[PDB]
Design brief:
The protein is of the alpha+beta class and about 375 residues long. The chain is built from twelve helices and 20 strands. Strands 1, 2, 8, 9, 10, 11, 18 and 19 form an eight-stranded mixed sheet that branches. A hairpin with a 2-residue loop joins strand 5 (about 75-80) and strand 6 (about 80-85). Bound molecules: flavin-adenine dinucleotide. Flavin-adenine dinucleotide binds near residues 40 and 270. It is classed as antibiotic.
Length: about 375
């Protein structure tokens, strides 16, 4: 019952870590509270560095074979006029980004994990108790199915409300909510949306981001002040919302507005603002939403989870092969990832807090 790594959470971050460790021959058990099939809303965006991880995992061809989309442009509008146009490929060819539903990528990764004999995935399972040795390393973990494991390393890949973080490391985080919630819905795909990603914001705090997802659908991400968001999402046949959009979303996206046939399918997007001071303690490390929360206006939750996963895999690989002490490996992991995650956490908060003020908002983008 000795294992190398116990991963708490089989979300995109934990799955990626499991596969990368598995590919190297390490003995991994992944504990996931939900069913494997269980499919929810999630982030959709892979940035260049996340794409490089997927390429290194041998998955990049399959991503677009499974309905992932390469893109290289964004338009940003404020009060119905074009504020910025970005071409991410103008100077660098690999500047492109990918839109891929997080759950489709996760499914792809789990398919690959099935093939890795040294990884065992336990769905509808949880950690029940842990014991620490005299050096305060976790040396034994009891699951809720009675299974006892003896892992060298424990990883929290268990998301924004992380059990590992809160219950195994006793870290609490103070969370002050933003005044505008975010919601996401999935609609039919209009030609304007297939053509180009378009983000719209206005002086009264509206936001509407339209982008294609999968083969034949479109995502619409919206934000409004809390009270107004409730009012709009109550005319469930969507006339109120459509009218609201028409105030700040121009004719280029008329068919994308018309695709918003009702509001019942909208789901709230969790919002945090966090970059933890410590990514690890003892033989416990964390990744993704367990250590940082970026405002979802950035779309980068999945991206940074995958980036973390790759860096942690490299660190744990070195430690498990005896090339460096676990404590040095984990320090190196944090040193690499903390400033990258920090930059995006600061950027998201900047965008979300500035979007009513046109040149201020413009100012955040330029950087
Ligand atoms: C409902 C929803 C909608 C979202 N929509 C968007 C969006 O439109 N745009 C966007 O940019 N971002 C969105 N996000 C955020 C984005 O999905 C995350 O930032 C990203 O998936 C974080 O990756 P992760 O791997 O760190 O954690 P998660 O994806 O949170 O994965 C954590 C995993 O750990 C499991 N888990 C949690 N606690 C335990 C436990 N005690 N024991 C065992 N397993 C556990 C979970 O069931 C889950 O599978 C959304 C998130 C949610 C929940």
């Amino acid at each position: 019952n000795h294992i190398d790594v116990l991963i708490n959470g089989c979300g995109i971050g934990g799955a990626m870590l499991a596969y990368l460790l598995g590919r190297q021959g390490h003995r991994v058990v992944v504990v996931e509270q939900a069913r494997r099939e269980y499919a929810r809303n999630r982030a959709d965006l892979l940035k260049p560095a996340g794409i490089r991880v997927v390429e290194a995992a041998g998955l990049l061809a399959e991503v677009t074979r499974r309905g992932g989309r390469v893109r290289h442009e964004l338009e940003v509008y404020h009060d119905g006029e074009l504020l910025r146009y970005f071409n991410y490929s103008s100077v660098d060819a690999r500047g492109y980004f990918i839109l891929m539903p997080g759950e489709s990528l996760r499914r792809l990764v789990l398919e690959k994990i099935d093939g890795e004999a040294t990884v065992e995935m336990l769905f509808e399972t949880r950690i029940e108790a842990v014991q620490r040795d005299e050096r305060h390393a976790i040396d034994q973990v009891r699951l809720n199915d009675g299974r006892v494991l003896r892992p060298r390393v424990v990883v929290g890949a268990d998301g924004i409300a992380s059990y590992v973080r809160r219950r195994l490391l006793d870290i609490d985080v103070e969370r002050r909510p933003y005044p505008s919630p975010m919601l996401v819905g999935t609609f039919a795909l209009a030609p304007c949306v297939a053509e180009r990603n378009r983000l719209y914001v206005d002086s009264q705090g509206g936001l509407a981001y339209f982008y294609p997802i999968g083969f034949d659908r479109a995502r619409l991400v919206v934000s409004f002040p809390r009270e107004e968001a409730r009012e709009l999402m109550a005319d469930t046949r969507g006339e109120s919302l459509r009218r609201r959009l028409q105030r700040f979303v121009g004719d280029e996206s008329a068919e994308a507005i018309a695709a918003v046939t009702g509001t019942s399918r909208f789901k709230g997007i969790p919002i945090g603002y966090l970059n933890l001071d410590r990514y690890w303690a003892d033989n416990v490390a964390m990744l993704g939403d367990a250590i940082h929360n970026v405002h979802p206006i950035t779309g980068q939750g999945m991206n940074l989870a995958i980036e973390d996963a790759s860096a942690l895999a490299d660190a744990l690989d070195l430690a498990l092969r005896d090339a460096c002490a676990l404590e040095d490996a984990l320090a190196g992991y944090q040193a690499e990832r903390f400033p990258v995650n920090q930059a995006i956490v600061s950027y998201g908060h900047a965008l979300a807090t500035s979007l009513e003020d046109r040149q201020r908002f413009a100012g955040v983008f330029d950087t």
